[PDB]
């Protein structure tokens with residue numbers, strides 16, 4: 001399992017958490033020195049448990065599928081909650097089975113359905129360590145509309161930061177003051193599967209993407225990533241989605 005406490009959190013302890021989260025994900029190979037997540041894991045071992053504690057010390061446990069870093073559901077006190085999607089229903093066969101009751105959220109876990117549920121795109125929802133403390137708190141008691149925005153904060157501040165060093169840094173910059181994600185952050189999130197695929201296709205193709213990936217950079221400008229020598233590949237991405245899952 002991995003854990004993160006908001007009480008006394010700072011950029012250093014958040015970075016220790018994101019490092020523990022990356023290191024908990026199994027891999028057998030690296031591709032261009034980036035860990036390649038597994039095609040598949042059977043049974044309970046598919047799910048990592050992330051114990052998150054709000055500033056008051058209240059806790060939820062979040063289940064994350066280790067092949068794709070997708071959050072499947074969470075336990076808060078004696079109730080489990082899962083997204084309304086078959087991968088999550090599958091996860092509910094393995095994790096939090098000792099919950100006294102199980103609620104299926106009224107949406108799946110993808111960004112488009114979550115933003116519809118929340119009533120706002122994630123361009124407009126501040127993220128940071130304080131937003132994550134709020135998100136944990138929100139999830140402690142069921143409210144499906146509030147939970148969709150809490151989950152948009154939770155996914156970005158845990159999974160997306162694990163995938164991209166730039167997003168980990170953005171959150172560290174927001175340790176004591178939330179701010180909406182930069183356009184670059186949103187771009188990276190939206191590009192993780194595409195980048196993961198092109199980095200794998202570049203093995204076999206002399207380091208060159210079969211298809212260029214368009215990203216927004218730190219200055220707000222749209223740029224084309226065409227091969228492994230790009231800073232996004234050498235310095236930023238930390239985990240690749242296996243092409244078997246794309």
Ligand SMILES: *[C@@H]1O[C@H](CO)[C@@H](O[C@@H]2O[C@H](CO)[C@@H](O)[C@H](O)[C@H]2NC(C)=O)[C@H](O)[C@H]1NC(C)=O
Pocket residue numbers: 208226227228229230231
């Ligand atoms: C591989 O990617 C690099 C970019 O990371 C390409 O070089 C850049 O692209 C043009 C010049 O052709 C300029 O806009 C950039 O400033 C270049 N940057 C650097 C650091 O060289 C390069 O052309 C690509 N190579 C292949 C074979 O696609």
Ligand SMILES: O[C@@H]1[C@H](O)[C@H](O)CO[C@H]1O
Pocket residue numbers: 069070071109110111112155159
């Ligand atoms: O399917 C994707 C994954 O859950 C991502 O990590 C967050 O949002 C969804 O669109």
